[model samples]
Target: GPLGSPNSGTKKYDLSKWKYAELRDTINTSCDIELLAACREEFHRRLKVYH
Candidate 1:
């Protein structure tokens, strides 16, 4: 669950190191906008970025 924010920059997980093929595979296999929205909302809540 170390989905580091892009705003955090390179200090966090190296975005370049991420595997695009794997990412595409995963997304294509599971492209659930509703689930993503829910998880993103929870992430934002925990990060205290918004109410």
Candidate 2:
């Protein structure tokens, strides 16, 4: 059945694990002299793998 997304499962669900500072650090550095967990998933999504 051609239905919903498969690969988008855990990748989006995984962001629940974070320290307030971890995301804060991404903004401070998105602007990444350093990096963290969530950013890896986020950045990789932006990588446009399917298309």
Candidate 3:
């Protein structure tokens, strides 16, 4: 499991390439908070950034 750190920009990009189905599976099965949070950011509905 190459669940890279959520804070890493590169990791974000890497995770972004993952299919939604596999992403959801990992999200549900993963216990790593940072990893989960990382995946959360990729979720469109969870995007909370506002400028």
Candidate 4:
């Protein structure tokens, strides 16, 4: 049906696979460092929710 997304079969991320710290380390290491840096440049860019 046109009402549904075409990429419905796309794999879902298993958030339980990694711990909190592990997830941060993986993204900081493997993912886009530049994007992260830019996020940091803006004070509104939040990486974690401590509150």
Candidate 5:
């Protein structure tokens, strides 16, 4: 069994192209806090900074 409902359809979004803020919101709603925080940290590491 997985985190979502058995009747739920699979989601396939363009996560790779999502901005940090967009990712933050999506993860907050859909993911486990502990695992999501780790993923957020990893995404932060790979992020590029701009003014």
Candidate 6:
């Protein structure tokens, strides 16, 4: 039926399982430094309330 939106399961991220700082460190030193900075900016924008 097209009445209500179809139910879709979403996964919640547990920060305890994945450390954002470590990820940023890896992305900066190993992966891409510029990309890491961009990701940090996005995180600041989205998580400003929490921080």
The TM-score leader among the candidates is 3
Question: What lDDT tens digits, residue by residue, belong to model 6 across residues 1-51?
Answer: 666643433432334333577666766676544556545655665568563
Any runs in candidate 1 off by more than 4 Å, and if so which? Answer: 1-29, 49-51
Who wins the lDDT comparison?
3
lDDT value, candidate 1, whole model: 0.48
RMSD per prediction, one decimal? 11.9, 10.3, 8.1, 7.9, 8.2, 7.9
Residue 38 in model 2: lDDT: 52
Residue clash pairs of candidate 6: none
Clashes of each: 0, 0, 0, 0, 0, 0
Output the worst ten-in-a-row residue range by lDDT, candidate 1. 9-18
lDDT of 2 at 14: 57
RMSD of 5: 8.2
Off by over 4 Å in 4: 1-9, 32-51
lDDT of 6 at 48: 83
Model 5 lDDT tens row, 1-51: 667674454543334555677667767777865547655765776675554
**Which regions of candidate 2 deviate over 4 angstroms?**
1-13, 31-51
**lDDT of each residue in 1-51, candidate 2, tens digit only:** 377665644443356455556566766666342245456665656556696
* Segments of candidate 5 deviating more than 4 angstroms: 1-14, 32-45, 48-51
TM-score winner, 4 or 6? 4
Where in model 3 is the C-alpha error above 4 Å? 1-13, 45-51
- Which has the higher lDDT value, candidate number 5 or candidate number 6? 5
Backbone-clash count (model 6):
0
CA error at residue 45 for candidate 5, angstroms: 5.1
* Model 4 agreement with the true structure over 1-51: per-residue lDDT tens digits: 777885655554434334445545655676655434433433232444468
